[PDB]
Amino acid sequence: MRILVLGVGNILLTDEAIGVRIVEALEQRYILPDYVEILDGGTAGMELLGDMANRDHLIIADAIVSKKNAPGTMMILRDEEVPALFTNKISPHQLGLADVLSALRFTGEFPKKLTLVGVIPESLEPHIGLTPTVEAMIEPALEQVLAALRESGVEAIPRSDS
Numbered sequence: 001m002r003i004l005v006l007g008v009g010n011i012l013l014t015d016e017a018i019g020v021r022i023v024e025a026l027e028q029r030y031i032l033p034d035y036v037e038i039l040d041g042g043t044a045g046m047e048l049l050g051d052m053a054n055r056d057h058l059i060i061a062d063a064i065v066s067k068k069n070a071p072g073t074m075m076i077l078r079d080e081e082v083p084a085l086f087t088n089k090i091s092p093h094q095l096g097l098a099d100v101l102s103a104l105r106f107t108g109e110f111p112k113k114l115t116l117v118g119v120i121p122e123s124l125e126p127h128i129g130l131t132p133t134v135e136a137m138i139e140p141a142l143e144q145v146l147a148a149l150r151e152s153g154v155e156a157i158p159r160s161d162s
Contacts, residue, residue, distance in 0.1 A: 003036045003152060004051060005145060006060045008093065010043050015071075015121030015134045019062040022117070022141050029142075030156040036149065045096025046103070053104055057152040058111035059145055060097075064118035066090045071122035072133040076144055082116045115148040117141050 007023025010016045020040050027038050041048050052058060064075055066088040077085055086098035104110045119141055122131040130138075146156050 001035050001152070001154075002055050003057045003149070003154065004055045004059070005036065005038045005149075006041050006048070006052070006058065007039070008041045008043070008060060008062045008097065010093075011128055012126060014123045014125050014127045014129065015119075015131055016063045016065075016124055017128075017130060018119050018121065018134055018137070018141070019060070021130065022061040022138060022145065025138055025142055026145060026156075029159055030146075031159055031162060032149075032156050033154055036154055043093040043096075045093065046100055048097075049100055049103060052100060052111070053107075053109040055111045057113040057115070057148065059148050060114075060116045061141065061145060062094070062116065062118055063121045063124075065121060065124070066094075067120060069120050071120055071131075072137055073120045074137060074141060074144070075118045075120070077116045077118065079114050082114050085116065085118075113152065117144045117148070 005023055007020045009019035011020055023038055083098050083101045086094040119137045122133050
């Protein structure tokens with residue numbers, strides 16, 4: 001079983017750090033089996049190709065910036081909806097991710113399952129630090145990545161039960 005939990009985004013842009021902070025909280029609070037890899041991919045594109053390939057379940061956390069919903073809204077997209085979502089002209093790093101997914105489809109190594117847990121940002125200003133409204137969404141987003149993990153048969157153990 002190969003599973004990757006990919007946090008993507010930019011810590012320097014306020015709420016565009018949400019993906020990276022989600023995956024940092026996971027790693028810090030839960031004990032997971034060795035076949036679950038956790039990676040901070042930042043704003044990288046094609047350099048992630050090898051990490052993303054041959055995954056039974058690929059879970060991505062990121063800020064959703066191409067939808068008109070209220071700041072702080074959480075959206076879960078699965079399978080064919082994630083490439084579609086990433087094919088936009090608002091976020092260049094998402095378009096690079098859409099190119100990586102295409103390359104993987106071309107070589108027959110597209111993830112068997114794909115889940116995106118996304119949160120719509122409040123502010124994208126140059127600054128290190130989430131807004132209060134997005135910061136309150138770390139826990140609920142974290143529960144969603146746990147649920148997606150549990151759906152592939154992995155149970156995460158809180159470190160507090162250790």
